[PDB]
């Protein structure tokens, strides 16, 4: 197994990471969720291109219309927090303590 | 040396990565992975990722990757982060491409480090295959079946993007 | 929500649960997961309070984040087989992946993190569905590899989510809150004989699912969120506490109940399987379930609580919602023991 | 799948592209379409678990196939010998390794 | 587990065909359908026995079946047909739309010559 | 090779064009989101080209034309409901 | 009669461009359904070859296949030299 | 008119594609033995590369099938120089 | 009146009439008369490689024909 | 010898657009009763060198609170991208032929966002982030019809290789096929030109731009006469075309007000998406339901 | 109860947490007197 399917394994390792590190930003880890999918893109197109599978070269696109679809949601749930609290800040996500 | 060009486009794909991922300012972070969104697509390119590749430039980056832009364009926080304002930050990005540089050197060194999986750090071109391809390029006649072998996934996949649209409002209707 | 709206919104919320129990492509899984997390949101988002927010806000980040790792459980799996059906998976890490991503979906290991918070937020009709129709599509997916898991990492998980499920109920004193807890308490049922037959699992499935129907419903007609506000309610409904106090203990799981119809075969399992350790600590540490189901019983009909005077207005009136199916799943929830061999028909 | 609906309705709706060996369009071969046309034909009808001792060297042979890990070492082996020898001044290749 | 058996330089040192891309194409018609007895042989081979290493014989046929029309055509009208391919690879995708008239002075030669 | 090397010279060119030019002397949120619902399911409907020539045109021809129905059924649900309509 | 003569009457007159948009998909619809050329279409198309003519064993029983490529037996595409 | 044209494209695709089916055979030989010789000759070099290495029972069989494999286009240059992997690999991609 | 704007537009018309011109010429240049041989499919690209190895001085745009063969 | 053509693909044009700044004023001279630059050179030809000229000379006053980086990164690939756009053109025989050009050419258009985002966010200040914020909304938003339009056409092309688009026209101008959407492509082509110290570039690129939208109008409706023989024929027919397609830009860009921002957004969503729905499955069944359908090789 | 929840309010009776206060964005715009629509 090659270092192109490590190098990106390791570029989601660091992005699941990142999701799971939640600094100060929810905005900040969503953007790390598509970037951490796209590893999952590539890994995708990796191993199917390769391997010459003809009929599996539709799902890469469909891994993309869907996590790309649930990003509007997850703009969407950011879109109105920010509203209510006025920031993105997951600092004030905690009003639900009990 | 274009004898390991995958390689250079593999190893900057992740620091491109470790770049947003060490949770820069939002926009900052943005363009910290379409950097890496426009790197990603070369290694699909390398491989005969044509339609792929142009997929990430088109839907992906040139998609939502701006109205993630726009996004934090509406948000604002009271200051616009950088990287130089969080020391935190420096510190995981550091962390980060040292550590792939170190394994790096010790993929390139003994070939056969196991983390995880075991792997060989051999050449990139080397798994690819020989065969001609005919006339008919297997990225796209392999997408163009979608409405030929793909009666399913159009069905559900149109379904669902049309549930997407009334969630979407739905929601942000506020009541 | 437009009531037609509403209406379709939960007909692919169940058509998404379907895909997954219908398809052996592995990618057609994933779809059947995304898309009921795709419309399941705006359900929690019905009243749009800031607690609902908080909760349905809550909910996407874990879900999303486990949809995510199952896909490499998926891609991994086909970099090192080649294959996409469901199937006895072919790489050990892929399944460990896996395992922790579904499990997250449910939530047994400190993945349970999701489950009350996200109860406590959103409605308590909303909270009916995601704890009792959402729980179906994961489980859906382990029956079918569970011939591929590595035992002893679910048996750890199923343990540790009976054991933390049931210890923080003790301290709970919001009957969502309580219900969260309680599920997660018998989502480690769920998962303990999982390797084993899957048949128990089913049986202990639908014998929760009714069971949770049942407590709901009743706490709904109640229209009570706090022990206090349905220690109330023996006033204006002493026969609806009575029946809850009923499923209390089928809730708890003593015999003749047919709350104790799962765990009764999960042991006879589970010893045929030369486990005799793990058996026990199940029913040992399942009695914390049943403290502070008395205590909310206590309060709720075995005693009586000071009512209020304004109460006697509700006396004149009475309720307009006609419980739908309700009746029959109290039934379906309490004397069902004496017909156990219908489990040979699950299987 | 749990409540498998395709065997009972007749109707395909993953299984056209559940394996790259399958029917594809135009024709087109998959890269490991030999092997895995002798794995899946080795266990049909023979369980689940009887397929993961009986098809092992099959599937052993298609699993070779999508990775080529011992092909990889192999060759990495000839390499690392080849410019472990060339640099001490031992065999020097052909005019036909260099053009 | 085994040895990869293939054949020596002796059978694998056999006549090659010495031309270019549009000398092929521009009389690819005409060699298809009289040069086919030793091409459907070879190609039946590749596809049945499965194994390159197995139909080396027809390959070498084949290819002697073609340097044998390439031959029978140069005792005939080859400037018809010199100033037909040389024509053929001035365009990019090598169409024969722009060279319908060189190419009817080169079929009428074999038309009836041949 | 020559796709790195046309990347290569005009990003050259840009930036020494600065060199001599530096060193020398919820609304609208919400119609963007629907860019991109919209925009994925173009994505589906791009292959199109090569989707038309396939054997079974039929199954092909049901599908195209489900797809652009969604498409306006999409867009005519967000008209109806408001949407579309750009809060002013 | 006078209802839909109406409301088309009044949706011509106010949107002009949505009626003309739902006649053209509307039209687009429909003619595949009675297409009298899409016969042709596919026939056309499964005669392209991207792949090459495998050969099918001579043991007789199998007179229909012809031997030499120019034989007449076989299938003939007249028609689409024509159309 | 466009209709009328785009039937001539599709008669000129066929004509187009005739030709190639016709040069398949002679390709197909061409290929075949030209990527075996290359094997062998890879071969050739690893009996003297491995000459003093333990077991190297030279041209080991990589799957237990007796079958023919197609060979990676990996171990099928591979001592070649740089220039013949690069215009291998990606050359089609490339070129433009 | 206006016969001035033309020569405002003939410098940038011949301007963008160098680029197509340049690329038309350098082609023919390089690939001596003929364009270079498109390869927008595998096909094409193979066809090529055969060409620059059968040329043997490793230039497909050298085109060798019957008089190659004897 | 490649080093020459991409030069040669890149001076010309600069010099091209910077007389384009003289053609824009001056076309727009003798219409309005001016008589557009003339005393700067012969009929102001060094107006062009004269404004590319004294621009670079100015100081770069960036304000503090823009960050350098960002202020200098957007105008950086504002241009980058908008002069490869240029490359794919099937001007006789493209530089890179790709066999996917229609996408090169629509994803790199898709990333112009970008120049203006940065460059209106990273200024810091009010009026310049709702206008970035205004530009950004209104370029992604016609990106739905260009795509959808793009798809249409090129139906009966064949595939997205660009150098198929001359072989497709030949005979007729495809604008006679697709004129319900020609004019659809060309409202679309000036909205997303955002046309109805570090200047001149930003100016150069977004007038590069100009002259490129209205060439690839050119080669995709306003076909032309291929010769293999005598390739410069079709380099006067295709430069002529694409000339008077920048006319057109600056005729209207004379000729009209503003479009209000809701007006902005209703025409597309409410009157041009629509309609271009319908027309794409128009241009889709039609193939079908004549047998029409174009060769992909 | 405990010390860390010797301060945890009960929740809001109808679920709905107490409103945000002012939020509100109403920006202040100087349109001129450079801008050339002011007129001067
Ligand atoms: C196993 C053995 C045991 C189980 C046996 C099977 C039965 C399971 C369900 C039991 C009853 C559950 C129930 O209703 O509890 C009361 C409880 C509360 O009822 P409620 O107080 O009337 O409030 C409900 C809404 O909030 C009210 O909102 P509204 O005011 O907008 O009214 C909408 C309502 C009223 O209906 C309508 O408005 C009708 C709409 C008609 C137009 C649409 C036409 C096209 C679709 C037609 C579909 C038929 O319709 C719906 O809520 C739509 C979903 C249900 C109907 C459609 C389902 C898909 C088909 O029900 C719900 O919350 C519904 C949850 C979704 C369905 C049940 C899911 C739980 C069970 C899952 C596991 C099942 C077993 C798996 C094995
Ligand atoms: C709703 C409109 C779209 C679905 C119906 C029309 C298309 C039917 C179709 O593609 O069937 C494919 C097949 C039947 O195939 P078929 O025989 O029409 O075409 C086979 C084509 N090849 C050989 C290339 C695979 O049916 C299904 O897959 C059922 C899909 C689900 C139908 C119900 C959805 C709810
Ligand atoms: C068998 C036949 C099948 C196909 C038949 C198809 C139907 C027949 C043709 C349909 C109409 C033509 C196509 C649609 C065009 C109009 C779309 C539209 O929305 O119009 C109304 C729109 C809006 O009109 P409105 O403002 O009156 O409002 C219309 C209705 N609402 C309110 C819903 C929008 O018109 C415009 O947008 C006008 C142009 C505005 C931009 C300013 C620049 C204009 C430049 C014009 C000169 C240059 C033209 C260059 C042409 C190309 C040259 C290469
Ligand atoms: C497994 C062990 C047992 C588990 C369950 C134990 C349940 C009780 C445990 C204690 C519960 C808490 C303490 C008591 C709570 C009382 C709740 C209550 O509501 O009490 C008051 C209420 C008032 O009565 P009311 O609702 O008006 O109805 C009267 C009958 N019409 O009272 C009622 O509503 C009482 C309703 C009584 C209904 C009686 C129905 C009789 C039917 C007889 C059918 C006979 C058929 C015979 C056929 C012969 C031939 C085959
Ligand atoms: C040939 C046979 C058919 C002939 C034509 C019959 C149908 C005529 C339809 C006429 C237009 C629709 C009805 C109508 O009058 O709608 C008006 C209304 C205008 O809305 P608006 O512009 O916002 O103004 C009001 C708010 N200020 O409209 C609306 O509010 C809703 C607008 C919805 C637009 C949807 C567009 C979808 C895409 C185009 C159609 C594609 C094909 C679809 C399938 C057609 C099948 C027949």
């Known amino acids: 197994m090659p270092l192109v399917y490590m190098n990106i394994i390791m570029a989601f390792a660091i992005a699941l990471a990142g999701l799971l590190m939640y600094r100060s930003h929810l905005m900040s880890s969503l953007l790390c969720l598509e970037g951490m999918m796209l590893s999952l893109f590539i890994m995708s197109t990796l191993i199917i291109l390769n391997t010459h599978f003809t009929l599996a070269n539709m799902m890469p696109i469909i891994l993309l219309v869907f996590a790309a679809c649930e990003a509007a949601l997850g703009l969407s749930l950011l879109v109105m927090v920010s509203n209510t609290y006025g920031t993105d800040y997951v600092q004030n996500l905690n009003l639900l303590q009990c | 040396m274009t004898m390991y060009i995958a390689f250079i486009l593999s190893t900057i794909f992740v620091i491109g990565f470790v770049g947003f991922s060490s949770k820069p300012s939002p926009i900052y972070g943005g363009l910290g992975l379409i950097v890496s969104g426009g790197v990603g697509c070369g290694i699909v390119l390398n491989f005969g990722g044509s339609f792929l590749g142009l997929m990430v430039f088109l839907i992906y980056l040139g998609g939502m990757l701006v109205v993630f832009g726009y996004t934090t364009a509406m948000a604002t926080e009271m200051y616009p982060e950088v990287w130089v304002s969080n020391k935190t930050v420096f510190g995981a990005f550091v962390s980060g491409l040292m550590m792939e540089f170190c394994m790096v050197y010790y993929a390139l060194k003994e070939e056969e480090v196991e983390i995880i999986f075991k792997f060989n750090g051999l050449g990139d071109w080397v798994i690819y295959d020989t065969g001609d391809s005919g006339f008919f390029s297997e990225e796209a006649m392999g997408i163009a079946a979608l409405y030929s072998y793909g009666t399913w996934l159009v069905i559900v996949t149109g379904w669902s993007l049309l549930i997407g649209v009334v969630v979407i409002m739905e929601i942000t209707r506020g009541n | 929500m437009n009531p037609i709206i509403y209406t379709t919104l939960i007909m692919t919320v169940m058509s998404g649960t379907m895909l997954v129990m219908i398809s052996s492509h592995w990618l057609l899984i994933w779809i059947g997961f995304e898309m009921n997390l795709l419309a399941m949101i705006p359900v929690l988002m019905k009243n749009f309070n800031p607690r609902a927010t908080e909760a349905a806000t809550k909910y996407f980040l874990t879900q999303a984040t486990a949809s995510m790792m199952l896909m490499m459980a998926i891609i991994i799996n086909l970099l090192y087989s080649g294959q996409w059906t469901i199937t006895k998976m072919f790489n050990p890490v892929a399944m460990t992946m896996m395992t922790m991503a579904l499990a997250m979906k449910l939530g047994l290991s400190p993945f349970h993190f999701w489950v009350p918070e996200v109860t406590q937020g959103i409605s308590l009709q909303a909270g009916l569905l995601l704890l009792t129709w959402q729980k179906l599509a994961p489980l859906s997916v382990l029956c079918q590899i569970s011939q591929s898991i590595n035992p002893n990492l679910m048996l750890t998980m199923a343990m540790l989510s009976i054991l933390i499920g049931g210890w923080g109920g003790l301290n709970q004193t919001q009957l969502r809150k309580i219900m969260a807890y309680s599920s997660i308490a018998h989502m480690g049922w769920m998962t303990a004989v999982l390797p084993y037959n899957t048949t128990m699992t089913i049986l202990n499935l639908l014998i929760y699912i009714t069971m949770t129907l049942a407590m709901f419903m009743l706490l709904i007609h109640s229209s009570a969120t706090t022990t206090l506000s349905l220690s109330h309610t023996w006033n204006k409904m002493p026969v609806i506490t009575s029946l809850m106090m009923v499923t209390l203990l089928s809730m708890g799981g003593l015999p003749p109940l047919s709350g104790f119809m799962p765990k009764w075969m999960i042991i006879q399992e589970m010893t045929k399987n030369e486990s005799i350790i793990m058996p026990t600590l199940m029913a040992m540490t399942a009695l914390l379930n049943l403290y502070f189901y008395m205590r909310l019983a206590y309060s709720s009909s075995l005693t009586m609580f000071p009512s209020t005077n304004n109460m006697k207005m509700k006396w004149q009136f009475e309720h307009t919602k006609q419980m739908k199916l309700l009746p029959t799943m109290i039934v379906l929830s309490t004397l069902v023991l004496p017909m156990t061999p219908a489990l040979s028909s699950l299987n | 799948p749990f409540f498998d609906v395709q065997k009972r309705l007749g109707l395909d709706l993953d299984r056209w592209m559940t394996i790259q060996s399958a029917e594809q369009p135009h024709k087109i071969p998959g890269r490991c379409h030999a092997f895995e046309k002798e794995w899946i034909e080795c266990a049909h009808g023979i369980g689940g678990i009887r397929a993961e001792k009986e098809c092992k060297i099959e599937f052993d042979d298609f699993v070779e196939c999508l990775l080529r890990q011992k092909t990889m070492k192999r060759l990495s082996a000839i390499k690392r010998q080849r410019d472990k020898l060339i640099k001490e001044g031992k065999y020097t290749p052909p005019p036909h390794h260099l053009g | 587990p085994g040895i990869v058996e293939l054949p020596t330089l002796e059978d694998l040192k056999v006549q090659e065909v010495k031309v270019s891309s549009s000398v092929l194409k521009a009389a690819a018609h005409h060699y298809g359908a009289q040069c086919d007895k030793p091409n459907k042989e070879f190609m039946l081979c590749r596809w049945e026995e499965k194994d390159p290493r197995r139909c080396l014989e027809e390959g070498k046929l084949v290819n002697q079946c073609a340097l044998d029309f390439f031959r029978q055509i140069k005792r005939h009208c080859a400037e018809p047909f010199t100033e037909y391919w040389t024509c053929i690879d001035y365009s990019g995708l090598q169409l024969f739309r722009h060279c319908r008239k060189q190419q009817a002075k080169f079929d009428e030669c074999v038309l009836d010559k041949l | 090779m020559n796709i790195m090397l046309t990347l290569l010279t005009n990003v050259t060119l840009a930036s020494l064009l600065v060199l001599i030019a530096f060193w020398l002397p919820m609304k609208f949120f919400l119609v963007a989101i629907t860019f991109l619902l919209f925009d994925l399911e173009i994505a589906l409907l791009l292959p199109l080209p090569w989707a038309s020539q396939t054997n079974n045109l039929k199954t092909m021809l049901t599908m195209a034309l489900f797809l652009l129905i969604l498409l306006a059924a999409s867009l005519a649900y967000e008209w109806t409901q408001k949407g579309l309509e750009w809060a002013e | 009669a006078g209802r839909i003569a109406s409301f088309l009457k009044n949706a011509w007159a106010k949107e002009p461009v949505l009626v003309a948009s739902f006649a053209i998909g509307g039209l687009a619809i429909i003619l595949p359904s009675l297409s009298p050329y899409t016969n042709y279409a596919i026939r056309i198309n499964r005669a392209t070859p991207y792949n090459y003519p495998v050969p099918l064993r001579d043991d007789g029983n199998m007179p229909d296949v012809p031997s030499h490529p120019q034989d007449p037996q076989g299938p003939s595409l007249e028609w689409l030299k024509n159309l | 008119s466009m209709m009328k044209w785009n039937r001539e494209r599709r008669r000129l695709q066929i004509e187009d594609f005739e030709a190639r089916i016709a040069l398949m055979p002679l390709f197909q030989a061409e290929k075949d033995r030209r990527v075996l010789q290359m094997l062998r000759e890879n071969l050739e070099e690893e009996a003297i590369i491995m000459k003093d290495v333990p077991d190297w029972k030279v041209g080991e069989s990589v799957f237990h099938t007796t079958r023919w494999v197609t060979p990676m286009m990996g171990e099928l240059y591979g001592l070649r120089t740089n220039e013949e992997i690069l215009s291998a690999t990606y050359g089609f991609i490339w070129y433009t | 009146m206006w016969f001035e704007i033309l020569p405002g537009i003939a410098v940038m018309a011949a301007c963008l009439f160098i680029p197509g011109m340049a690329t038309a010429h350098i082609h023919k240049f390089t690939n001596g008369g003929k364009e270079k041989r498109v390869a927008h499919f595998s096909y094409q690209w193979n066809l090529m490689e055969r060409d620059r190895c059968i040329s043997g001085v490793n230039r497909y745009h050298v085109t060798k024909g019957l008089e190659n063969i004897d | 010898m490649f080093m020459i053509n991409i030069l040669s693909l890149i001076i010309p044009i600069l010099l091209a657009v910077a007389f384009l700044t003289l053609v824009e004023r001056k076309v727009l001279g003798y219409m309005q009763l001016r008589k557009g630059p003339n005393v700067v050179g012969p009929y102001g030809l060094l107006q062009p060198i004269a404004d590319a000229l004294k621009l670079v000379t100015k100081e ?211 009157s041009f998406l629509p309609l271009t729905l319908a027309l794409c499955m128009w241009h889709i069944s039609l193939p079908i339901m004549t047998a029409s359908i174009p060769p992909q090789s | 109860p405990t010390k860390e929840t010797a301060h945890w309010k009960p929740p809001p009776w109808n679920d709905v947490d107490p409103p945000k206060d002012t939020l509100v964005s109403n920006l202040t715009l100087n349109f001129g007197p450079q801008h050339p629509a002011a007129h001067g």
């Open chain 10, 60 to 270: 770069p006053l960036r304000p503090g609170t823009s960050s350098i980086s960002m202020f200098i990164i957007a105008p950086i690939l504002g241009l980058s991208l908008a002069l490869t756009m240029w490359v794919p053109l099937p001007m006789p025989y493209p530089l890179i032929n790709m066999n996917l050009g229609v996408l090169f050419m629509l994803a790199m258009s898709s990333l112009a966002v970008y120049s203006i985002l940065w460059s209106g966010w990273a200024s810091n200040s009010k009026y310049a982030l709702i206008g970035a914020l205004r530009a950004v909304a209104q370029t992604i938003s016609y990106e739905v019809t260009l795509a959808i339009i793009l798809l249409s056409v090129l139906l009966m092309n064949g595939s997205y290789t660009l150098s198929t688009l001359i072989t497709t026209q030949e005979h007729i101008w495809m604008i006679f096929t697709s004129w319900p959407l020609a004019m659809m492509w060309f409202i679309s082509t000036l909205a997303e030109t955002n046309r109805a110290g570090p200047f001149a570039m930003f100016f150069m690129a977004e007038y590069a731009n100009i002259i490129m939208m209205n060439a690839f109008t050119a080669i995709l409706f306003l076909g032309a006469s291929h010769d293999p023989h005598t390739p410069e024929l079709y380099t006067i027919n295709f430069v002529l075309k694409t000339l008077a397609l920048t006319i057109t830009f600056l005729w209207i860009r004379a000729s009209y007000p503003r479009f209000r921002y809701d007006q902005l957004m209703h025409l597309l969503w409410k």
